[PDB]
Amino acid sequence: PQITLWQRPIVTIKIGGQLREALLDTGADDTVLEDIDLPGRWKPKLIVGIGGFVKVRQYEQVPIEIAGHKVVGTVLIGPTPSNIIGRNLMTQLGATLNF
Amino acid sequence: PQITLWQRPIVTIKIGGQLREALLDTGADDTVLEDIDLPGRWKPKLIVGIGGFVKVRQYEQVPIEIAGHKVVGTVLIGPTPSNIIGRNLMTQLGATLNF
Ligand SMILES: CC(C)CN(C[C@@H](O)[C@H](Cc1ccccc1)NC(=O)O[C@H]1CO[C@H]2OCC[C@H]21)S(=O)(=O)c1ccc(N)cc1
């Protein structure tokens, strides 16, 4: 799809058998979700956003469906005021910005 | 232009006679710059953000050139780890996300 930016670019995701929404975020290097259970091993990571800092769990090689497209990559779990799909996974969709 | 997202989508901006770079950020509702003097009146705002809160100055009807395109809108000034161009101004460029 093509979408314009008059509203937030929110898409449906499926991860670990649960359905959520997330914002396609070209300003985010990494994908960060809050409201989700992932199984298995993970590593502590701190990420830095406008408001300071947030401490996250890094899950590697996570299967995720984004607007219908299956991909695998890194997902960070931690407090974020909005679930975010970052460029790590947008590149897998061949996403572009156009103007 | 069309750009891909393997690298951060950074563009050149000109504002208030000052040249800067900024990230094109579809996850940001508003444009937020740190490293910049604007003249005139402004209002306090809190914007929220991944690691919490930031206190910003809101400047209205600010002339800004983004990748060569002249627009006017709202610019927030305050601490941000990265200058970001939000949807308030990308809609003025007719920007779209495509996949
Ligand atoms: C500030 C950016 C360089 C970085 N961020 C992405 C950014 O798109 C966030 C993404 C975002 C979105 C909603 C809430 C928190 C963070 N948007 C944001 O801070 O925008 C603010 C300015 O406009 C307002 O509208 C949204 C909040 C305000 S971030 O959230 O800090 C971030 C940083 C690193 C990663 N991996 C993922 C996210």
Residue numbers in the entry:
A (entry chain A), B (entry chain B): 1 to 99
What does the literature reporting this entry say, word for word?
The PRS17/DRV complex crystallized in hexagonal P61 space group with a dimer of subunits numbered 1–99 and 1′-99′ in the asymmetric unit. PRS17/DRV complex exhibits the closed flap conformation. As seen in many PR-inhibitor complexes, DRV binds in the active site cavity in two alternate orientations with equivalent occupancy and related by 180°. All hydrogen bond interactions observed between the wild-type PR and DRV are conserved in PRS17/DRV. Interestingly, only two mutations of PRS17, G48V in the flaps and V82S in the 80’s loop, have contacts with DRV, while the other 15 mutations alter residues outside the active site cavity. In PRS17/DRV complex, the side chain of V82S forms van der Waals contacts with P1 phenyl and P1′ isobutyl in the two subunits similar to the interactions of Val82 in wild type PR/DRV complex. In PRS17/DRV complex, however, L10I mutation does not alter the conformation of Arg8 and the ion pair between Arg8/8′ and Asp29′/29 is intact for both the subunits as seen for wild type PR. Comparison of the DRV-bound complexes of PRS17 and wild type PR/DRV shows a large conformational change in the hinge loop region (residues 34–42) associated with mutations E35D, M36I and S37N in PRS17. The new conformation of Asp35 in PRS17/DRV is anchored by formation of an ion pair with the Arg side chain of K20R. Thus, M46L and G48V mutations in PRS17/DRV synergistically alter the Phe53 conformation by steric hindrance.
Protease (PR) is essential for the maturation of human immunodeficiency virus (HIV) and is a major drug target for treatment of the HIV/AIDS pandemic. Recently, we reported a multidrug resistant HIV protease bearing 17 mutations named PRS17. We demonstrated that purified mature PRS17 exhibits extreme resistance to all 8 potent PIs tested. Here, we present the first crystal structures of PRS17 in the inhibitor-free form and in complex with DRV.
